Amino acid sequence: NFLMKHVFHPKRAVFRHNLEIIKTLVECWKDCLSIPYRLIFEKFSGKDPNSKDNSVGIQLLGIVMANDLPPYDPQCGIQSSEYFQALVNNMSFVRYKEVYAAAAEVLGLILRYVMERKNILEESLCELVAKQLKQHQNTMEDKFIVCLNKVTKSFPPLADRFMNAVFFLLPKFHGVLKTLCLEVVLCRVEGMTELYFQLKSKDFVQVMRHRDDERQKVCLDIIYKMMPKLKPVELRELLNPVVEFVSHPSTTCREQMYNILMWIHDNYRDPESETDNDSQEIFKLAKDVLIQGLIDENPGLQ
Numbered sequence: 039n040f041l042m043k044h045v046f047h048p049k050r051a052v053f054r055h056n057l058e059i060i061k062t063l064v065e066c067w068k069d070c071l072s073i074p075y076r077l078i079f080e081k082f083s084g085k086d087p088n089s090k091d092n093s094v095g096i097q098l099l100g101i102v103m104a105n106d107l108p109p110y111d112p113q114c115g116i117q118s119s120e121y122f123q124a125l126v127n128n129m130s131f132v133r134y135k136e137v138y139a140a141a142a143e144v145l146g147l148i149l150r151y152v153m154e155r156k157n158i159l160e161e162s163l164c165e166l167v168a169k170q171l172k173q174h175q176n177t178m179e180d181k182f183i184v185c186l187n188k189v190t191k192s193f194p195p196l197a198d199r200f201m202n203a204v205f206f207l208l209p210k211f212h213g214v215l216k217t218l219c220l221e222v223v224l225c226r227v228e229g230m231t232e233l234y235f236q237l238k239s240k241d242f243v244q245v246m247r248h249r250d251d252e253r254q255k256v257c258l259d260i261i262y263k264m265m266p267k268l269k270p271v272e273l274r275e276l277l278n279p280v281v282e283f284v285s286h287p288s289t290t291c292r293e294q295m296y297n298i299l300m301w302i303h304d305n306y307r308d309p310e311s312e313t314d315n316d317s318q319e320i321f322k323l324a325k326d327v328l329i330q331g332l333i334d335e336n337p338g339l340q
Contacts, residue, residue, distance in 0.1 A: 039074050046094050053094075061101045073102055076116050083124045084131075092128045093136040099125070100144045109148040119161075126165045129185060132178070142185045146192035153193070167199055174200075179207055180215055187218040194225045201226065208240050216245070220256045227263045234264065234272050246279050251288040258283070258294040265301055273302070274316040281327050289336050296339055299328045 041063065045056040064071070082095025099110060111122055125148075128141040145166055152158050166189065173182045183204070190197045197204070201223065208219050227233060237260075246257045261280060265273070283295040306321040334340045 039077065042074075042077060042098055057097060057101060060098070061104065064102060064107075065105050068105060073107060073112075075110055075112065078102070078110070079117060079121050079124065082128055083121070084128075087131045088133045089131075090134050090136065092131070093140065096125075096128060096137070096140045096144050100140065100147075103144060103147050103151075109151045122162065123165060126162070126169050129166075129169045129173070132181065138181065138185060139188050142188035143191065146189040146196075149189075149193045149196070153195075163196060167196060170196075170200065174203060179211075183207060183211070183215060183218050183222065187222050190222055190225045197222055197226045201230070205236050205240065217250070217253045217256060220245070220253060220260070224256055224260050224263070227260060231267075234268060234276075237264075243279050247282075251286075251291065254283075254286075254288070254291050255294060258291060258298070262294060262298050262301070265298065270306075270314050270316040270320060274320055277302075277320055277323055281323055284327065284330065289339065292334065292336070293339050296328075296331055299324050299331070303328060 041056075042060055045053060045060070047053050047056070078095050078098045080095075081098060082092040084091040103109060110125065111117055111119060125141065126145060129138045129145070131137050145162065149162050149166065152162060170182060170186055170189070173185060186197065186200060186204070204219055204222050208216065208223075211219055242257070246254060248254075258280070261276060268276075280295055280298055283291050286292055286295075302320060302324045306317055306324070309317045309321070312318075332340065
């Protein structure tokens with residue numbers, strides 16, 4: 039109890055060392071150690087914006103969250119369920135960071151914990167969505183999608199309530215925000231019917247052709263996941279930017295392209311009669327570029 043009240047220090051190295059020794063204390067002595075959830079609540083219950091006072095509280099909650107502990111409010115009468123709101127409220131405070139991104143991350147783990155062990159399921163989710171929704175229309179589109187990406191790193195299903203807005207925000211974004219949008223839409227691709235129409239409606243090939251070697255990898259993963267349930271007509275158009283990834287400086291993009299190639303070749307092999315000329319053209323391009331892959335520079339994927 040005493041070792042977590044005096045951890046806020048000017049230098050960041052001392053704060054990190056204190057957090058490390060607190061984490062080591064909890065994991066080694068997990069049994070026969072009650073957790074003072076009131077102290078953490080008092081730490082992250084700040085009201086003044088741009089103050090950087092709830093960061094220590096959310097960091098303590100993340101530290102206790104990493105060793106399979108109850109996700110705050112163990113229903114021991116120490117606090118009430120309305121103090122679980124002060125944890126989501128933390129995502130509103132803008133500027134200085136470390137107060138909304140970490141809050142979104144810890145909230146995602148807590149939801150995941152509650153979706154895995156039954157008990158309460160969606161009660162946290164509604165407020166978190168409202169916070170995302172409020173941060174959506176009232177300008178501030180840059181913060182909304184990064185908070186959504188932080189949440190969806192542990193809880194994909196919440197993205198199901200914002201896919202339309204995610205696709206609407208895609209053309210106007212730039213830099214890393216476009217990448218965040220792309221992995222947000224990547225975290226939910228299975229069961230998303232008519233995904234190709236939405237992707238093509240926002241000029242997906244121009245996003246793929248731009249050299250980013252991380253965004254390109256994300257788009258390649260999206261294509262590899264979306265490849266089943268796709269007609270050969272769609273794959274005929276989609277294959278040319280994929281096979282343009284030969285001689286790409288990045289090894290990982292070439293490897294993902296090669297994996298796409300291996301899937302198409304077994305799947306399109308010996309097609310039943312002349313069902314579609316696209317099914318024939320698609321097989322020929324993949325087979326020939328797969329042959330071309332035999333002299334690749336990287337000795338591993340070769």
